[PDB]
């Protein structure tokens, strides 16, 4: 009638996709806004 080999059967997560998902999600990008060099306690400002 019917075999039942689901005892020694791996999960279905092994047969998923992981790459046919939703949109590309253009939210995680790079950081390319470098603040000015300025002056500080180490590199103090020059004279007038």
């Amino acid at each position: 009638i019917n075999p039942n080999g689901e005892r020694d059967g791996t999960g279905s997560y092994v047969t998923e996709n992981m790459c046919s998902m939703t949109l590309e999600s253009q939210r995680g990008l790079v950081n390319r806004y470098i603040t000015p060099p300025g002056v500080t306690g180490v590199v103090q400002q020059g004279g007038e």
């Binding site: 009638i1 019917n2 075999p3 039942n4 689901e6 020694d8 279905s12 047969t15 998923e16």
Partner: protein, 146 residues
């Protein structure tokens, strides 16, 4: 099995393909006619279909009601109501066996009969959550029925 409990079943390899699934329930009336509304449907809070541990689908008591509201009709709808409610003015204490057909894809057409025979290495299970309360059966509104 009980109100509010989560139960499940594993489908046996007693044939090659499966289609219709009907859950039989026995409920009693906790009040008179007019106090229940599709109580067997309300009782099945939800149901999940799982193959090899992967959820394939899920239905909710409200979904069954929504599905029915949109897709069943005429005497299909009436007969459905007959299998989930008390529609002949039954009275308090009445006992009835209700049949809740499931509506997973393979429970609607032979065309998609689940090929259990082709799934020799994976288990197939259903999970069912039973409502904590069913109107006119164990609670009248918020009032528990002794």
């Amino acid at each position: 099995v009980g109100f509010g409990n989560k139960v499940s079943t594993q489908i046996s390899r007693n044939g090659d393909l499966i289609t219709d699934i009907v859950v039989e329930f026995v409920l009693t009336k906790g009040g008179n006619g007019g106090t229940t509304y599709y109580p067997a449907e309300e009782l099945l809070q939800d149901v999940e279909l799982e193959i090899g541990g992967q959820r394939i689908d899920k239905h909710y008591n409200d979904w069954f009601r929504t599905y029915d509201a949109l897709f069943r009709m005429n005497d299909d709808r009436y007969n459905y109501r007959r299998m989930t409610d008390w529609v002949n003015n039954e009275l308090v204490g009445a006992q009835k066996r209700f049949y809740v057909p499931l509506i997973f894809f393979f429970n609607q057409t032979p065309g998609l009969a689940l090929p259990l025979i082709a799934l020799q290495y994976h288990e197939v299970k259903l999970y069912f959550t039973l409502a904590s309360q069913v109107q006119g059966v164990n609670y009248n509104g918020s009032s528990a029925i002794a």
